[PDB]
Each structure stands twice: as structure tokens, then as C-alpha cells.
Amino acid sequence: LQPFVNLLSKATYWWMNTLIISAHRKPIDLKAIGKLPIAMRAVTNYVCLKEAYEEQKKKTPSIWLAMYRAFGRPILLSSTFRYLADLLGFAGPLCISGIVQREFLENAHVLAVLLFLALILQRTFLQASYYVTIETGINLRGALLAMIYNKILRLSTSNLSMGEMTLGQINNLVAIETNQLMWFLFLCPNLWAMPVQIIMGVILLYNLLGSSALVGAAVIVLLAPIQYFIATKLAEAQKSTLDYSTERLKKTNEILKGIKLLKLYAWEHIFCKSVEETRMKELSSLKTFALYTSLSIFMNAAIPIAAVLATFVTHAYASGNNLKPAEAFASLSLFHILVTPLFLLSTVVRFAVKAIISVQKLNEFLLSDEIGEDVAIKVTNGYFSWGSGLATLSNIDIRIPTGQLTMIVGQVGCGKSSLLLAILGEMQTLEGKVYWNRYSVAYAAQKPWLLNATVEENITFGSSFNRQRYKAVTDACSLQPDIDLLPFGDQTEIGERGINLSGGQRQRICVARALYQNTNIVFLDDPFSALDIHLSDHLMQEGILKFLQDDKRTVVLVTHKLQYLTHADWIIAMKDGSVLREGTLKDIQTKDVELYEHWKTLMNRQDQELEKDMEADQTTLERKTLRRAMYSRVMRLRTKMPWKTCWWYLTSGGFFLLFLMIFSKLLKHSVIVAIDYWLATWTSEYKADQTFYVAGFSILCGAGIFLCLVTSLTVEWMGLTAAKNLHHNLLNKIILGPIRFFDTTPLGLILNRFSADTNIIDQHIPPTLESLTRSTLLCLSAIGMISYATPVFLIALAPLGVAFYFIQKYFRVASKDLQELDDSTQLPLLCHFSETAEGLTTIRAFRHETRFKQRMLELTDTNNIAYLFLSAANRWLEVRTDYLGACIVLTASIASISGSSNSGLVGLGLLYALTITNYLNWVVRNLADLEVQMGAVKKVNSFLTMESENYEGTMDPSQVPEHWPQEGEIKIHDLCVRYENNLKPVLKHVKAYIKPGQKVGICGRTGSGKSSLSLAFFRMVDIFDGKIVIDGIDISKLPLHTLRSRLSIILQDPILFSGSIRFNLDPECKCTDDRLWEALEIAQLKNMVKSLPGGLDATVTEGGENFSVGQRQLFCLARAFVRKSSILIMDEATASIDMATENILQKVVMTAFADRTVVTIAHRVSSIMDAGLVLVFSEGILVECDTGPNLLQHKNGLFSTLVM
Ligand SMILES: CCOc1cc(CC(=O)N[C@@H](CC(C)C)c2ccccc2N2CCCCC2)ccc1C(=O)O
Ligand SMILES: Nc1ncnc2c1ncn2[C@@H]1O[C@H](COP(=O)(O)OP(=O)(O)OP(=O)(O)O)[C@@H](O)[C@H]1O
Ligand SMILES: Nc1ncnc2c1ncn2[C@@H]1O[C@H](COP(=O)(O)OP(=O)(O)OP(=O)(O)O)[C@@H](O)[C@H]1O
Ligand SMILES: [Mg+2]
Ligand SMILES: [Mg+2]
């Protein structure tokens, strides 16, 4: 009995049962799920698929043949199960005909029991086929991901091969093409099962109804081309909507990062309107998409009705016999059977075409350019090239002594990085040989590569953690001062996803990773490129010379700092892809005196140039940015369906639309039941005159078609209205919020609310709601009609319904976990592939390909097990609801046979009992989908219920003059500034009198509250005591727009917004082009604008990447001059700016802004030694407020110490 119970457990998915039941007790996690079986692990499937692919390559290789030879037998098994289920599905109409007709097989109860058994077997076989094909598709996805990851690990990094689009193509293959191929393998048995089922259904219809059934067969067969055409139009409209949504999301992201500047300039509403224009275009495209969706729904619901109408009218007239209940309702059952394959065969064909495209892309990727197969390293007569045939490195003959520092020196473009990568084997070897006396190399690439992991996980890089070595490595690279600034320290997730670091910090972290590894050979490729003199010298003295010589490492150091050549044991001088001369410094000097003299001249010139420029500190400005970035730093609910969120979404389109949808759907399903009952009455008159019944049937069918159209239009109209209203409210609501909200909430969360939740509301919810309402109404009408035919069925409705409740309860939570789990596993795996595409040279130099292969296999196995268990929960639910439906069919059949009203009613009840089995599962599935989507609607509403700023001022706008800050007086009385309630005040008792047209310089130590004062000028920070009176008007008693739009501010990092230069200068477009040209000339920028095509309407890239940072700062100066505020705030504007551009900025401020009151937070204190009023801040307290010379003459003063 053990094999029998094992087979039953497999067939009913009983092994999921416990995992479902536990979902109420505790959330489902990866620990609750087991591991993948050996036959299901990605490694075994990868080996099978790779063996098949290599067999094909032996013989151009066929991916399709490899997939068939690897994962073909399970497809044949699932096809056998699908054919058995299709055959056992036609027992429905046959048993309906037999029962309605009323030796042994003639018995009606025998036929009812046989129909029950046939339904149970059919559903078991169908779910088995679904599970087998889904498992095979998941195995194929794992194998394909492993194959493409190995191909990635083999990829060549040359610019000819590894282009800028290669990483995007890899991401597309991992995230899209592999999933398209997996879904095609999911749906492939349909491709040869649906045609057979359709042909057999048409044959059964013909056997039932003569040639009259061929008319309905043709009409309903017309549904497949119509659905294919409608799906083509849907794809086109979806691409259009996706383009418009991408533009809208680009604009929204540009607003969100940079919202502080927009609020300071009071340009938030202009950018909101700019986003709303793109939103309106996207909404028009979405309207076309919804129109085609409603067409699809209407056709799916109306072609069957027209086919039934044509069939039965043609039978009433052409056929000489009366319509019989058995034939009529068996044919109705056959039509209902045929609807689904005809509607979904177009989907299967579309997936087949997309799979052909995906296999073409995958096969074109699997055929890509890939890398080829004392003294530690020696190159003899080496001729290397980057794949173009032209040798980049010609006649390379070098020697790298073991355990000695080797420095490669040459001008930019010599081929030093090329020499290192040719030694590592990353480029083609035309001639020569590289001898290693390969081996693992600690490689620090010229472009630093960071994993999306913590600082410690980047530095250790798959190596055992040693605290002494880790501390020594961190000290040598001077990483502790900037690690301490990180929120979590070593455990701070850095990289693309995590905290953004400066180029110098990333370079030092990669150098630390190179130093930490205990490999005898270290390759450093310009490690001082993004560092300053002090950090470079410390790394050279402690890391290269001390730490790397304690371990006796063979160090190869590509550098431009020739001053370090005195520390070199071996020197390799390059020029134009060839070595001029190699050897010790003394040997080079003796043999090649000219090269030594040239090196001396270069060292002297570099020292002379750096002597003046050493004043600027790169590391100080990196650490200040990193420190400023950190200034800001349920069981009952699990099963609670969000009915309030559902009601809010339904009423967000208006009560008329909701009423129209509900009324139209109720009327449509009433009419459908009416046509079924009319057929019942017509057949129960069984040649009489058919005119009355034909006329009534035609009228009912026409009304049903019209109501199908009405409901299809109405649900999509409601969805469009709700989406429009929700997004329109959301954008404006979040923009008006305080700056503290944007400082606290990450940009990722807000952008998710604007992209993913918006897409869910726009395109996912309307179809889910339509399907849920349709399935629920079909089930309710079926139950009502079965109970009307036989009231005793209601007795069995109490148990079965109760069962249904539990079946819908547990599933609705279990899947909710599994889906989430699936998502939590999709993000890492994809990221892994990206981390391997960029950083491939580092991985292959460290020789850590095996570790990354293992990590990829783990990630894909986790993703596959999550997806498999989600699908298994779906199969569990389908089996449960299918057995419920079989019980319903058996009960209805027995009740109808025992107590018969008439033959037509028996047939009608049997048909409805048979049909409810299809929709019971979809009621639960759509309810779960609706709950998931209402989660996103709840997120959007939560963002919509946030608190905004107080944009309405106390003062009467008539009281405020037209030119309010005309003079520029400022009076700060007992100012107490905090960034949020319950936090400590950041400014305490600041009192100052800024004379109109007086140049004020604000200075102090880091964290003293200088930027907080500039924010208090704009009321971007919470003032709770004291006041700021600007030109006689308290700014607290003022609208925020009037205050912020009449004051000019210049921040440190300049930000320009995508659009025209005229748009950047004034989005409001109040000024004239002559004024804009005058401002551009003032900012010493008119010639640059003239050089650009179009002048004032030259396109600015997002962030202003077209212009240099100095040009961006000059643009900010031009905007400030356009504003004509007479009060200009400059928050360390000259920082991160070239010295020449800094002098230009100072000249512009002195000349053009001579009249305006300039309040400058000096980046360099010496710049405000001659300022009229100097405000010195210490720890939030105004220590000194006097003239510059007055503070200078007072010895031992804070300003005097700052100046020195
Ligand atoms: C992850 C794969 O998920 C499945 C995968 C399958 C495999 C399958 O032959 N589908 C047939 C469905 C039946 C009605 C023919 C089909 C055919 C064409 C288009 C879509 C579909 N189906 C696609 C999935 C959702 C239901 C319509 C079954 C069921 C599921 C499921 O979600 O439970
Ligand atoms: N990945 C690559 N694929 C193809 N060609 C490349 C690649 N990297 C560099 N080259 C080319 O090979 C030549 C050698 O330049 P390379 O980058 O090796 O010099 P370098 O001395 O390291 O220069 P730099 O000081 O600018 O870093 C140049 O013509 C360069 O354009
Ligand atoms: N966004 C913020 N949220 C909360 N507190 C903040 C925020 N920004 C700054 N603070 C707090 O206010 C203090 C005042 O520093 P602030 O940035 O205002 O000016 P600062 O002294 O000129 O700074 P820095 O020299 O680093 O640019 C900070 O030390 C910090 O404690
Ligand atoms: Mg280089
Ligand atoms: Mg500051």
C-alpha cells in the first residue's frame, strides 16, 4: 500500500500541505522549504544541457536539439498526461447527454458516478501535466542560467567584443529571454494538445447536432485569429505605454534626486506639470491599451454566444427534428470546453514566437568572442593584441623579479594596463610566450570594481578574516577615517545598491582587497590615480613598501608618480606598446642617460606644479561629503484581506462608474442565465413551430452580446479613471511634503511607489478585478441555478462551501509568502550576473571563477526552489478546487436524477455544475492576485496620506510688496534652529544684523550649523524660537513660494535639469531672451552657449553632464542673476570647482552682485578675511560676529585659528 499512498501524495500534492498549513502559524521562508533534489539542482541540469550542447557542436549547434535531448522525456510524459486529461474532459458532455436521455450504461446513477470518476481522473492528470512541465521549465531555466554564466566567465573584455551594450544584453538574457524560454516550455504541450482537443470537440459537436454544429464550430473557431490580432495590438499599445512611462519615470527620478534644490528655488510645481504632461500622454496610450483589452474580453465572451445562437437557429431551421435537451446541453458543454483552447492557442503561438527569438539571442550570445586558453613572470618576444589583428603590444620582452617591487612607467596610452592584462591573459597573444615561475594574482584594476556587499566583504573577497591583517591593510590604505563615517562601518553595504563612495575611496578599497589576499603576486594598475599626495605617499610607504615586503610579495605597480621610482627594485619603461628599456634605476641611468634626465625633468615639473596646488584637499572634500550624507541618519494582519483598500480603489473612479460596472455585470450574467433557461424551456418542448423560441433566443443572445460589450468597456473605463486619479494625487502630494521626508525615506522606495505600484494600478488591477468579478458571478449563478433545479443541493452547499473557505483561506496566505520569497530571490541572482559582467578581469586575475560559479549555482537553486514551491502551491489549490467541483457535479447529478423537474432543467443543472469546476480555482487565484495588488494600492494611499509643508502664509499677500527683498536687510533675533521636533537644536541664540548690500561671510568648523542658517533663510529647516526679518517682513509669516522664489541660493554641487538652457535659466519663462543672454554674459558663459547648437535652446543632459562642473556652477550663477533677488546665498559654491573657475566665480560675484547682499559660507576661510560682517559658528553657537579685520586683530580667536 506504500507505493499507492506515495502515488496519491504525489498526485494530490500532499507534500505541500504542511507547508501551506504552517503559513498561518509563521511566514514561509527559505529555511521552511528544503533544498532542491539532486535531479533538480541547477548543476545537474547544467551538466545535462551542456552535454547535449557539446553533442550538437560535435555535429551551427542547435539550442533546440540540446533542449530536446536534455529535457524532452518529461515533456513527453506531460503530453501523455495532457492527452489523457483532454480525453477524460469530453466525458463531461457525453455523460450529460447520457443522463439527460435517462443496458448497464443506460442507468443514470451509473453515468453520474462515471462522470465523477472521469472528472477526478481528468483533473489529476491535468495537474500532473502542469506540474511536470513547470518543473521541466524550471530545470531548463537553471541549466540556461548556468550556461550563460559560464559563457560570461569566458567572455573577452576587449572594446571590440565587450561593448557598452554587452552588459545590457546580458541582463536582458538573464531577466527576459531565459524567462520567455521557460514560459514557452511551460506552455509547449498546449501547442499540440489544444489543436487535437479542438478537433475532437468539433467532431463531438458534429456527432451531436449534424451539420448545424459546423456553423457554430466555424463561428467559435474564428476566435483564435481574432485573439491573435487583438494580442498584437495589445503588445503595440503596451510598448507605447512603456516608452511614455519610461520618460515619466526619468522625469520623476530627476525631480526626486534634486528635490531640495527645486524646493529652494520654488520650481517644484513647474516640474510637476512637466511630469503631468508625460503622464497624460502615457494615459492616452493606456487608454488605447485598455480599449484593446476590453475588445479581447468582449470577443472571448461574445464569440461563444454568437456561435451558440448560430448553431441553434441553424438547427431549428435546417434540421427536421425538434431540439432535444441532451443534444442542446451536451453541445453547450462542448462549446464551453472549446472556448478556452481557442482563446489561449494564440497566447501559446505568441510564446512560441518569442521563444524562437529568445533562442536566437541566446545562441548568438553563446557564440561570442572569449578569452583564449629569480623571475616570477617573464614575457619573451610577446606580441599581444586586443582582437583587431593589429598588435597593441609589439616585441614585449620583460622580466618581473620574484619578491621585488616592479614599476611600469610610461605616458598615457603606452599600454601599461595592456601589458598587465596580457600577462594575465586577457588579450590575444599573436606571438611570444609568457612563463610563470598560471597563478592567482591580486589585481587592483585601473577602474575600481566593487561588489554590492559590505566593506569587509569587499576587502576580504572570499578569504579568511584575520583581524591583524585586516587592520594592517585598512591602515595602509587609510580607510579607517572614512569607514568610521559610514553608518555601519565595515558592515556598510557599498557599491551600486549601497552607499555611494568617492572614486578615491573605491580605489583604496580595491587596493585594500588586493593587499589583503595572500597571493605572492600583486598587480596594481594606477592605484594613486584618484588619490592625493598624502594618501598616495602613506599607501606607498606602509602598503607597498612595508606591508607587501613583510610578506615578500611580487608587486607590479603601474604608476605615473615618477618620484616613487627610487623605491623600485625593477623598472619597466614603455612607449607606444613597447618597452624602451628595463632594469634597475641605476642601470637605466647608466645605459639610457636621456631617459633618466627626462624622468628627472618630469619629477621636477610635477613637484613645481603640485607645490601651488597642494592647498586643495581631495580627501577632506570626500570625507566631508561622506559625513554630510550621514547627517540625516502579524498573524491577524496576514489573513486580513484589505477590503477598505478595495473599496477606496473602486470608488476612486467615482460612484457612477462603480454602479455602472456592478449593474452591467449583474445584468449580463442574468441574461446569460436567461439564455440558458430559454434553451432549457425550448428543449423541454420535445416538428412544432420554432418561431417563438427562435425569436426569444435571438433577442436574448443579442442582449447578452451587447451587455458583454458594455461590461468590458465599463471595467476598463473604471480602471483608467482610478489609475489617473491615484497617480495625479500621489505626485502632487509627495512633492509638497517636507524635505525631511526625502532625507529620511530612500529614493528607492519613492521611485518604487512611482514605477511598480503605478504600473500595478494601471495595468494589473483592472484585468484582475474583471476576472475575479466574472468568475465569482459565474459561480454564484451556477450555484443559484443548481439550487433552483434541485433545492436539496443546498444541503450539500453547507459542507462544500465550508471546505472552499478553508481552501481559499490557507492558500491566500501561503502563496502570499511564496510570491514574496520568489521576489526576494530574483534580485540577488540578477545582480550576481551583473557583478560578473563588470569585474570579469578581476575575477579571472584572482582566479576566483569557481567561487563565483558556486555562488551563482546557490542563487539560482534558491530562486528555482522558491518558484517551484509557488507553482506547487498553485497545483495544490487546483487539485483541491477540482475535487470540490467533482463533488459538486456528483451531488448535482444525483439530486437531478432522483428528483427531476424536467429534462431541460436536468441538463441545465448538469451544465452549470460542470462549469463551476472551472471557475472555482480562478475565484481563489484572482482573489489572491487582487490582495497582492491592493497591497500596492495601499502603499500609494499611504504615500497620499502624508503631511505637507505649510505653503500658506499668515500675512496678507497684499501687505507683501511686489519687490519685497529690494534692499536686502536681514535681522536674526534669537534664532533657534532644529531639523525636526524631538531633536537637539542645531542653532542656538543666533543674533545678527546684516546690512543691506553687505557681504557677509559665514565660517566655522564642520558640523557647526552654517548650512542650517542658509536653510533657515529659506525655511527649509524648523525654526521654533526667534525670528528672521528680511527687509522688515518676518519670513515665518510668509507663503513658502513667495519667500523661496524671491531669494537666490547657490549650493556647493551644481545641478542642472534635463531640458533647454532657457528652461534651466527660468522654467517659469517670465524673463526675456535678452535678459537670459545678459545673464549668460554675466556668468562668463555667453560664448559657450553660442558655440552650442541653437544657443539658448541647446539640450542639457540630465544632471548637466554636457557641461563641466565649473560650467555648471557658472550656470547656477546665471540662474541666480536671472532671479534678481537682491539677497544671494552661496553655500560653499567655490568648493569642488577649479581654481581658475573659482576666480571667475569670485569676479562675477564681486562685479554683478555688488549691489546684492551676498551671504557666503566660505569654503576657504581666507576668502572672507575682508568681508564686512563675519559670523563664526561653533557647535551651533554664534561665537563671533564682527568685521573680518576686527576678528583678525583679536588674538587667540576662533576666526584667527581658522584662518591659520
Ligand atoms: C508558472 C506556470 O503557471 C501555470 C502554467 C500552466 C501550464 C499550462 O498549460 N497553462 C495553460 C492553462 C490551461 C487553461 C490550458 C495556458 C495556456 C495558454 C496560455 C496560458 C496558460 N496558462 C498560463 C498560466 C496561468 C493560467 C493560464 C498551468 C497552470 C499554471 C498556474 O499558474 O497554475
Ligand atoms: N579593453 C580594451 N579593449 C581594446 N583596446 C583597449 C582596451 N583597453 C585599452 N585599449 C587600447 O589599447 C591601447 C593601450 O592603452 P592602455 O589603456 O593599455 O594604456 P595605459 O598606459 O594603461 O594608459 P592610461 O594611462 O590612460 O591608463 C590604447 O590604444 C587603448 O585605446
Ligand atoms: N538633514 C539633516 N537632518 C537632521 N539633522 C541634520 C541634517 N543636516 C544636518 N543636521 C544636523 O545639523 C548639524 C549642523 O550641521 P549643518 O550641516 O547644518 O552645517 P555645517 O556645520 O556647515 O556642516 P558641514 O560643515 O558638514 O557642511 C549637523 O552637525 C547635524 O547634527
Ligand atoms: Mg592604464
Ligand atoms: Mg555646509
Swiss-Prot record:
- Entry binding sites for ATP 1: 410-417
Cytoplasmic side: which ranges?
1-79, 129-180, 234-288, 350-654, 714-785, 925-1204
Compartments in which it is found: Membrane
Q: Which family does it belong to?
A: Belongs to the ABC transporter superfamily. ABCC family. Conjugate transporter (TC 3.A.1.208) subfamily.
Q: Which UniProt keywords apply?
A: ATP-binding, Glycoprotein, Membrane, Nucleotide-binding, Receptor, Repeat, Transmembrane, Transmembrane helix, Transport
Ranked from the top, the taxonomy reads: Eukaryota, Metazoa, Chordata, Craniata, Vertebrata
**Cellular component GO terms held in the UniProt record:** acrosomal vesicle; cytoplasm; inward rectifying potassium channel; membrane; mitochondrion; plasma membrane; protein-containing complex; sarcolemma
Subunit and partners: Interacts with KCNJ11. Interacts with KCNJ8.
One annotated GO molecular function is: ATP binding
Give the superkingdom in one word. Answer: Eukaryota
Tell me the PROSITE patterns matching this sequence: ABC_TM1F, ABC_TRANSPORTER_1, ABC_TRANSPORTER_2
- The protein depicted here goes by the name ATP-binding cassette sub-family C member 9
Q: Does the keyword Transport apply?
A: yes
Q: Where is the ABC transporter domain?
A: 377-601, 970-1204
- Ligand binding (ATP 2): 1004-1011
